[PDB]
Amino acid sequence: YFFPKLTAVEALAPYRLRTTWSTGEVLEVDVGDILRKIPDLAPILDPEAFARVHIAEWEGSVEWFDTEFGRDNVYAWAKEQAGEVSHEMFGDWMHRNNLSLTTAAEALGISRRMVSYYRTAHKIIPRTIWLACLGWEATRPETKTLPRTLP
Amino acid sequence: MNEYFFPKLTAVEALAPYRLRTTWSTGEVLEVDVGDILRKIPDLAPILDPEAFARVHIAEWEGSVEWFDTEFGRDNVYAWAKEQAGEVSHEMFGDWMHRNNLSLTTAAEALGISRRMVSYYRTAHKIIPRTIWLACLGWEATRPETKTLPRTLPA
Lengths: 151, 155
Hints:
Chain B: GO terms for molecular function: DNA binding. The structure is a homodimer. By secondary structure, chain A is of the alpha+beta class.
């Protein structure tokens, strides 16, 4: 799952969006690259159709014609474009290392609850935690204790 | 499917009746005769006056080629300009998709090209090569029920 709720979206100058969330966050995000990448999204490149952006009823997604972008993906891209670590980066770290909430928690030295919060975007990911994720990847396998230097 | 037309009409100039010169955001400068279409729509008869024709411009906001009232959509004018030069228009290509009930997926599969390239051709983002249009017509002539294509046309 994904914790934040989208409460507003507004089109700026193509192809930038302003998104407002239940967390009180107001985040901007450029969706130009994805609209140019995916052929099916071509009608949205027309500046009059782009301006038509709204929240979809059922799904809480960013929509022009039909639920184009899940709110979770939009939230991650905004974090990433802003130079922060997104819940998707954290999820990718877990998936590529075949970690559960439990083994991720043990990997990082934090609680299971905290791992869940990071993966669900319930809590923003500190720089410290992402450095730890990479540090953990750089020190595999699990030795008896952590090394004094990088291998 | 919804429509997107990539080129923007950036200038229109009345030449000798009834030819126009059109400039586009693609860099293209294309001439096109509209005399035949004007003659076929009784409501457009006043435009046939050389003085009236000379007053062609781009419609405020709406963007069509206009004399009195948004007469020709820029996308149609672009298509006619291509067709009159003996080139394949995005409308010919879109008509081929439409009359065969094709999507980006089934058109791409039909022709053996990418969905992106189908979209580029459809939306006038890329000029359509002669080879591609011949392929559209060949596919229509055989409409293969399998992936494998026949050695000859059907009888």
